[PDB]
Amino acid sequence: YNYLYRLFRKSNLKPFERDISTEIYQAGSTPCNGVGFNCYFPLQSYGFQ
């Protein structure tokens, strides 16, 4: 689980843009609040077995 990717963002990356931010993504009216329904922690893992 040391290997991760971003699954959600406010806008797409430009060529060679780098963005390590852990801040919560908002998919609807739900404010991020450090957590929810249509709000997400934006980083995910492959879990390679």
Binding site: A27, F37, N38
Partner: protein, 50 residues
């Protein structure tokens, strides 16, 4: 669940946003498409299985 009811949905405009405007839905799991994209898309038919 042994005898699930299927409704064919056709010839109509599908406001999928209603299905996540309500706080009542405990789980919402989408496959092949994002829930935000649904109000933009068009389909030959829709089948609602319950």
């Amino acid at each position: 669940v042994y005898a699930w009811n299927r409704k064919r949905i056709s010839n109509c405009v599908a406001d999928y946003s209603v299905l996540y405007n309500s706080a009542s839905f405990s789980t919402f799991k989408c496959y092949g498409v994002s829930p935000t994209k649904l109000n933009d898309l068009c389909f030959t038919n829709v089948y609602a299985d319950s």
